[PDB]
Write an enzyme that holds these catalytic residues in place. Structure first.
Site, mmCIF file in Angstrom:
data_model
loop_
_atom_site.group_PDB
_atom_site.id
_atom_site.type_symbol
_atom_site.label_atom_id
_atom_site.label_comp_id
_atom_site.label_asym_id
_atom_site.label_seq_id
_atom_site.Cartn_x
_atom_site.Cartn_y
_atom_site.Cartn_z
ATOM 1 C CB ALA C 72 19.411 -20.372 6.101
ATOM 2 N N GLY C 117 24.051 -22.763 9.965
ATOM 3 C CA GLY C 117 24.642 -21.871 8.989
ATOM 4 C C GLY C 117 24.651 -20.470 9.575
ATOM 5 C CD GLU C 227 30.124 -12.167 41.733
ATOM 6 O OE1 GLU C 227 29.790 -13.273 42.213
ATOM 7 O OE2 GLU C 227 30.611 -11.236 42.415
HETATM 8 N N1 LIG Z 1 17.468 -27.103 21.969
HETATM 9 C C1 LIG Z 1 17.190 -26.800 20.734
HETATM 10 N N2 LIG Z 1 17.999 -27.180 19.745
HETATM 11 C C2 LIG Z 1 17.562 -26.782 18.507
HETATM 12 C C3 LIG Z 1 16.400 -26.066 18.201
HETATM 13 N N3 LIG Z 1 16.289 -25.855 16.848
HETATM 14 C C4 LIG Z 1 17.344 -26.435 16.342
HETATM 15 N N4 LIG Z 1 18.160 -27.007 17.287
HETATM 16 C C5 LIG Z 1 19.420 -27.733 17.047
HETATM 17 O O1 LIG Z 1 20.342 -26.828 16.420
HETATM 18 C C6 LIG Z 1 20.845 -27.416 15.193
HETATM 19 C C7 LIG Z 1 20.071 -26.918 14.015
HETATM 20 O O2 LIG Z 1 20.539 -25.718 13.424
HETATM 21 P P1 LIG Z 1 19.634 -25.249 12.132
HETATM 22 O O3 LIG Z 1 18.231 -25.018 12.524
HETATM 23 O O4 LIG Z 1 19.852 -26.270 11.068
HETATM 24 O O5 LIG Z 1 20.316 -23.962 11.677
HETATM 25 P P2 LIG Z 1 20.461 -22.545 12.231
HETATM 26 O O6 LIG Z 1 21.633 -22.663 13.193
HETATM 27 O O7 LIG Z 1 19.208 -21.993 12.726
HETATM 28 O O8 LIG Z 1 21.028 -21.658 10.963
HETATM 29 P P3 LIG Z 1 20.969 -22.087 9.363
HETATM 30 O O9 LIG Z 1 21.801 -23.336 9.090
HETATM 31 O O10 LIG Z 1 21.568 -21.033 8.423
HETATM 32 O O11 LIG Z 1 19.492 -22.312 9.115
HETATM 33 C C8 LIG Z 1 20.612 -28.905 15.321
HETATM 34 O O12 LIG Z 1 21.701 -29.503 15.986
HETATM 35 C C9 LIG Z 1 19.318 -28.952 16.117
HETATM 36 O O13 LIG Z 1 19.249 -30.184 16.841
HETATM 37 C C10 LIG Z 1 15.560 -25.686 19.247
HETATM 38 O O14 LIG Z 1 14.516 -25.046 19.152
HETATM 39 N N5 LIG Z 1 16.030 -26.090 20.517
HETATM 40 MG MG LIG Z 2 17.459 -21.421 10.151
#
Ligand SMILES: Nc1nc2c(ncn2[C@@H]2O[C@H](COP(=O)(O)OP(=O)(O)OP(=O)(O)O)[C@@H](O)[C@H]2O)c(=O)[nH]1
Ligand SMILES: [Mg+2]
Ligand SMILES: CC(=O)O[C@H]1C(=O)[C@@]2(C)[C@H]([C@H](OC(=O)c3ccccc3)[C@]3(O)C[C@H](OC(=O)[C@H](O)[C@@H](NC(=O)c4ccccc4)c4ccccc4)C(C)=C1C3(C)C)[C@]1(OC(C)=O)CO[C@@H]1C[C@@H]2O
Ligand SMILES: Nc1nc2c(ncn2[C@@H]2O[C@H](COP(=O)(O)OP(=O)(O)O)[C@@H](O)[C@H]2O)c(=O)[nH]1
Ligand SMILES: Nc1ncnc2c1ncn2[C@@H]1O[C@H](COP(=O)(O)OP(=O)(O)O)[C@@H](O)[C@H]1O
Ligand SMILES: [Mg+2]
Ligand SMILES: [Zn+2]
EC number: 3.6.5.-
Lengths: 426, 291, 412
Positions: C72, C117, C227
């Site tokens: 990732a 990422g 829209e």
């Molecule tokens: N609302 C909400 N925000 C989330 C959730 N999971 C992660 N986030 C938010 O999204 C960001 C986290 O991104 P990551 O999970 O680190 O990464 P990713 O975008 O999935 O991709 P990688 O970095 O390559 O793993 C943070 O700001 C978290 O607070 C979720 O299930 N719901």
């Molecule tokens: Mg991830």
């Protein structure tokens, strides 16, 4: 993903037995048995540390490097000792002399090729490799010298896969060896320039944390080791579990290293309460951050309170609120704005697994990249000079085919390494 | 501390409609490529001669070198854009006067000033040259007995420096090094100024092609990290991030000088490579801040 | 008519599983019914696996579940360039294979998490490759931009100043839901210090249901996807409105549920209920799309809104006489059987462009500098096929997004 542990030296080895003692149970793998796993989740990701051959025999994919038979012959003649495929044992029946030079240039240099051989057999195992775990002590031959070589070679063979290093930096108060700063300064040198994640543990930072944070009165080595192995399990293996917000070696690396040196961290476990009594369960969460972020409880020798942080990674692993987690971290970042460096709006890297340490309800590994560790390489570096100046036990190095400029090199290097780290404390 | 000065220049290679545009109204340091505006310290069109380029970009460093400061002039960019031509990597003897590059011109001014200050001289000065090649992230001493043998924990300093007393000597080291030279190959010819108490270096770096098809680039790249780490004072500099920053470690220090020469093609077919080269210049330009 | 959806990044996938849940839930299509209409991308297998192991397991085709066993990396570069690249083709293929099978579609509702990422980087080029392959459609990307103080990743801004600049010139309308500012709602408007990610997801999982689901669903005042962007973006910048929901009352505690329109609409403009830490600290609205659902009398609205239009303390832009797109649906909302959402018989999912984000962007840009100012984790991207260019040149990018969101307002 995957990784391949590396038990360099005796210590790094002794610990192997404890790191695997644990990890296995945290994966239901009996001596030679298979997956008795109380659950079904402790298996979908095991690969990270084992290999499929029989169907009940998932063998740890680590390496056991050492020039002293007796050692590996104590680890292989005891408990879980009979789970490693013999191919893993890369021994050097030679004289495992306590000289960094004897295990890095003269004696170890031979046994190396017969190691790399296997480190490739294991790397080319299957799927995709992530990195290698490295355990050892920077205060001996087979540890600092030969293990510090093993990596310099590894990092030439796969400058892609990561390299976590678990070093037992020479404890202050009392040195369990004499040339210590020699074997040390020389290995840190190799570290600052190959592995890209180092977790420095101190036999006496442990005692303390093990004799006052665990009313434990007779902290045998097995224990210390056990405590350490507890942290390295929270780090790796752990994150190779599900989580609301999971990370993995890289995240940990790509969120913790602002500047390429490689930088060394200081691991800290969460629930660290004495057995019976203490079993206070005050583990709602503010209790874990209370823990992790205090001075004592940092496996390192130095005290965070003595220098800002660059990064922090609370790798929690137990069902909790992404709110009471994400939140706490904040106040923590504000109550101590003083020491937490500023040019990083959010130093902390909150990580959150799901399943916790087998028998516990909620834990959280701490991996701190504080500038405080400056005051340790200082220590080491001092001890060197004070004795280098007189070339103390230098004949045991040179006489082994070394250089008077080699020692100069390391000290400086590692000595500069102290410098830099201050560039941020300010 | 910080470097004394980090400068970035761009040189447009000769046209074989140029994608490189020099605005009718500008400070002479700007250019536009694919509608993108770039601003550096020097922007040289294909019409700029070697003499002018050297006088504007390198001559100023000569005094610094003589004063004891470490200096590095590095050419980077796509293959065929004039890097070797600009740095003067070809043996002077087989080169027409007006086409002589940075190396021979710099050495000329170094000798002149050394001979002019050898009477109100404190100590005596001696000049040398080293020729190092970095093939697949591995340092090679092109002037030693084992030019095809990798170096380690010594490529930083331990490498043969041959005496220089005239242009003829430079021609010898360049010819010798070229023969002993063997999918990227970087060259680093260093003019060493040595005295009993001082040692300053003028590193003339000619990097391999930056075009694609750790990551080909990474040196310079690693160079930007080093520049930044020093500014923010990370109290650990990523010198070992690459062989380039390791070999030039002694020159990448406080009150040292670093000058980038981005060479770019004026051809439309090389637009992508040109943009990559210019974008890097912008990044190095920002990293040069606080210096 | 339709609108594909590409949930990118673990988060965009967790939120995805959620929004995807609420769906069948209000369409009577249990675990195993029809066939979705989206895809799932991630460079960390274990997460998409959760959609392969957990609930809603067989409601998907192992074909609309893309994974890159590889790594990732919480860094844009790697996810966009280096690694993320390898997968993209394949990714696209589905959004070209799923885009064909349909009948005259309208666009792709993209779900990503700005500061990640796989979420920042990757998409960056996914939306990138879309704007060219289907410039003739809608590109509404539903983002979860960086918590104002409670961020996670250490680099976050690097990853979010980079997903903004690369997607900016490619999206149609970018919806934004602030992770932290949603917690407040869970603390202040529902009461619970135990909000699992699985909740925030149920929430957006709600506000989103109000966007596509119900809207693409017949009603007394239908509102197509187009829209939106039309009635919602005053200018080409892939403008980012904010999502807000009205009846965010607790299904246990208080119970005044029966809160006629006149109330639920006023409850949208109070800053403590907008899934975004962009409190209308000054940001003049410039267009709001009040999507209502449930039992609502058009006069009730064409009155409740009138009352608002004259509150003045709600100051709308100058160059905008009337900026109120009233979207009325029939079927009331549909709350999880037993989560923590009240369950009213009418709601207001109002989204809008507010000169407010002038802030949110600002505060997130500044972050960036601080670190870039020292290169911080720069070596992590460079070594991943990026340059001093992409950063510095994406910084300048947003700079004109701080001026843009400033000029289009604050002035008359
Ligand atoms: N609302 C909400 N925000 C989330 C959730 N999971 C992660 N986030 C938010 O999204 C960001 C986290 O991104 P990551 O999970 O680190 O990464 P990713 O975008 O999935 O991709 P990688 O970095 O390559 O793993 C943070 O700001 C978290 O607070 C979720 O299930 N719901
Ligand atoms: Mg991830
Ligand atoms: C009845 C009961 O609840 O007993 C607990 C217990 O009393 C306490 C005191 C345990 C206990 O740990 C120690 O006493 C200890 C001994 C040497 C070094 C370090 C610690 C325990 O032994 C440790 C054990 O830990 C685990 O089971 C984790 O899965 C842990 N496992 C191991 O370390 C391990 C030990 C032996 C063999 C194989 C593995 C783990 C932690 C992190 C990552 C992976 C695994 C637990 C909860 C307990 C006992 C059994 C008493 C504590 O430690 C841990 C690591 O959980 C010490 O403070 C905590 C709080 C616990 O409540
Ligand atoms: N925690 C810990 N430290 C150990 C163990 N064994 C040796 N050490 C430490 O390691 C140092 C000695 O190096 P040693 O391991 O004997 O070197 P080698 O065996 O020649 O490679 C001392 O500082 C010891 O405290 C152990 O099992 N656990
Ligand atoms: N400014 C210039 N004036 C005249 N000829 C040039 C100029 N720059 C490049 N050339 C010629 O173009 C060819 C390639 O130049 P070169 O430096 O070897 O490119 P590079 O080293 O970047 O791969 C050589 O013949 C060189 O003499
Ligand atoms: Mg050339
Ligand atoms: Zn009521």
């Amino acid at each position: 993903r995957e990784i391949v542990h590396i038990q360099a030296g005796q210590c790094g080895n002794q610990i192997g037995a404890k790191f695997w003692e644990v990890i296995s149970d945290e994966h239901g793998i009996d001596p030679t048995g298979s997956y008795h796993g109380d659950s079904d989740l402790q298996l979908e990701r095991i690969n990270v540390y084992y290999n499929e051959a029989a169907g009940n025999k998932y063998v740890p994919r680590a390496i056991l490097v050492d020039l002293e038979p007796g050692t590996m012959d104590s680890v292989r003649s005891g408990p879980f000792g009979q789970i490693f495929r013999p191919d893993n044992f890369v021994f050097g029946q030679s004289g495992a002399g306590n000289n960094w030079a004897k295990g890095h240039y003269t004696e170890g240099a031979e046994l190396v090729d017969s190691v790399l051989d296997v480190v490739r057999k294991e790397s080319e195992s299957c799927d995709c490799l992530q990195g290698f775990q490295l355990t050892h002590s920077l205060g001996g031959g087979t540890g600092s010298g030969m293990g510090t070589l093993l990596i310099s070679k590894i990092r030439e063979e796969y400058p892609d896969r990561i390299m976590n290093t678990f070093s037992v930096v020479p404890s202050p108060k009392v040195s369990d060896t004499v040339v210590e700063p020699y074997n040390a300064t020389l290995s840190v040198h190799q570290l600052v320039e190959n592995t890209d994640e180092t977790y420095c543990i101190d036999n006496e930072a442990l005692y303390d944390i093990c004799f006052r944070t665990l009313k434990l009165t007779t902290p045998t080595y097995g224990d210390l080791n056990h405590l350490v192995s507890a942290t390295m399990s929270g780090v790796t293996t752990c994150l190779r579990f599900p989580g609301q917000l999971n990370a993995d070696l890289r995240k940990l690396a790509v969120n913790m290293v602002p500047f390429p040196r490689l930088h060394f961290f200081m691991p800290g476990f969460a629930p660290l309460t004495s057995r019976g009594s203490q079993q206070y369960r005050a583990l709602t969460v503010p209790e874990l951050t209370q823990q992790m972020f205090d001075a004592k409880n940092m496996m390192a020798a130095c005290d965070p309170r003595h220098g800002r942080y660059l990064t922090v990674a609370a790798v929690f692993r137990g069902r909790m609120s992404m709110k009471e987690v994400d939140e706490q971290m904040l106040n923590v970042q504000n109550k101590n704005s003083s020491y937490f460096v500023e040019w990083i709006p959010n130093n902390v890297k909150t990580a959150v697994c799901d399943i916790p340490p087998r028998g516990l309800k909620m834990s959280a590994t701490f991996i701190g990249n504080s500038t405080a560790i400056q005051e340790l390489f200082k220590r080491i570096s001092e001890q060197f000079t004070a004795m280098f100046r007189r070339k103390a036990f230098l004949h045991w190095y040179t006489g082994e085919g070394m250089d008077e400029m080699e020692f100069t090199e390391a000290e400086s290097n590692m000595n500069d390494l102290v410098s830099e780290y201050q560039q941020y404390q300010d | 501390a910080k470097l004394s000065a980090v400068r970035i220049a761009v040189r447009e290679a000769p046209y074989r409609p140029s994608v490189v545009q020099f605005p009718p109204w500008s400070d002479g340091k700007s250019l536009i490529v694919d509608q993108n505006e770039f601003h550096f310290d020097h922007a040289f069109p294909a019409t700029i001669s070697q003499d002018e380029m050297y006088q504007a970009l390198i001559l100023p460093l000569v005094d610094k070198l003589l004063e004891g400061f470490q200096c590095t002039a590095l050419a980077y960019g796509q293959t065929g854009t004039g890097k070797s031509y600009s740095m003067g990597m070809t043996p002077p003897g087989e080169i027409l006067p007006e086409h002589l590059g940075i190396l021979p011109r710099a050495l000329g001014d170094i000798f002149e000033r050394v001979t002019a200050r050898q009477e109100n001289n404190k100590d005596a000065i001696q000049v040398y040259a080293s020729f190092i090649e970095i093939y697949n992230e591995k340092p090679f001493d092109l002037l030693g007995s084992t030019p095809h043998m990798p170096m380690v924990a010594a490529r930083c300093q331990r490498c043969t420096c041959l005496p220089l007393h005239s242009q003829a000597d430079l021609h010898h080291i360049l010819e010798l090094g070229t023969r002993n030279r063997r999918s990227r190959s970087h060259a680093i010819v260093t003019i060493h100024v040595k005295s009993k108490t001082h040692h300053s270096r003028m590193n003339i770096v000619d990097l391999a092609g930056s075009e694609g098809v750790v990551n080909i680039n990474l040196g310079l790249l690693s160079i930007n990290k080093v520049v930044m780490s020093m500014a923010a004072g990370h109290t650990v500099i990523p010198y070992r991030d690459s062989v380039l920053t390791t070999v030039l470690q002694a020159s990448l220090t406080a009150q040292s000088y670093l000058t980038f020469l981005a060479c770019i093609s004026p051809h439309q077919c090389d637009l992508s490579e040109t943009l990559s080269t210019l974008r890097f210049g912008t990044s190095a330009k920002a990293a040069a801040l606080e210096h | 008519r339709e609108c594909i959806s590409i949930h990118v990044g673990q988060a965009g996938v967790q939120i995805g599983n959620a929004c995807w849940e609420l769906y069948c839930l209000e369409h009577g299509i249990q675990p195993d019914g029809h066939v979705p209409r989206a895809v799932f991308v991630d460079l960390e297998p274990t997460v998409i696996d959760e959609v392969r192991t957990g609930t809603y397991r067989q409601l998907f085709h192992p074909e609309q579940l893309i994974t890159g066993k590889e790594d990732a990396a919480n860094n844009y570069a790697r996810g966009h360039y280096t690694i993320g690249k390898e997968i993209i083709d394949l990714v696209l293929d589905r959004i070209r294979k799923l885009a064909d099978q349909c009948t005259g579609l309208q666009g792709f509702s993209v779900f990503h998490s700005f500061g990640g990422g796989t979420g920042s980087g990757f998409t960056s080029l996914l939306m990138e490759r879309l704007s060219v392959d289907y410039g003739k459609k809608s590109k509404l990307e539903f983002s979860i931009y960086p918590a104002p103080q409670v961020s996670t990743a250490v680099v976050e801004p690097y990853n979010s100043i980079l997903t903004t600049h690369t997607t900016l010139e490619h999206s149609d309308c970018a919806f934004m839901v602030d992770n932290e500012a949603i917690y407040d709602i869970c603390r202040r408007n529902l009461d619970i210090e135990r909000p699992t990610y699985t909740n925030l997801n149920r929430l957006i999982g709600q506000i989103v249901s109000s966007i596509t689901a119900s809207l693409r669903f017949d009603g007394a005042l239908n509102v197509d996807l187009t829209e939106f962007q039309t009635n919602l973006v005053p200018y080409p910048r892939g403008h980012f409105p904010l999502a807000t929901y009205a009846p965010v009352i607790s299904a246990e505690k208080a119970y005044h549920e029966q809160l006629s329109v006149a109330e639920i609409t006023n409850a949208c403009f109070e800053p403590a209920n907008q899934m975004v830490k962009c409190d209308p600290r000054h940001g003049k609205y410039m267009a709001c799309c009040l999507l209502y659902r449930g039992d609502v009398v058009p006069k009730d609205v064409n009155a409740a809104i009138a009352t608002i239009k004259t509150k003045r303390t709600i100051q709308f832009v100058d160059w905008c006489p009337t900026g109120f797109k009233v979207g009325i649906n029939y079927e009331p909302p549909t709350v999880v059987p037993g989560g923590d959402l009240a369950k009213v018989q009418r709601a207001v999912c109002m989204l809008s462009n507010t000169t407010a984000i002038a802030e949110a962007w600002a505060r997130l840009d500044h972050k960036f500098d601080l670190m870039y100012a020292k290169r911080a984790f720069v070596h992590w991207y460079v070594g991943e096929g990026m340059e001093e260019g992409e950063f510095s040149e994406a910084r300048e990018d947003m700079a004109a997004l701080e001026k843009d969101y400033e000029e289009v307002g604050v002035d008359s």
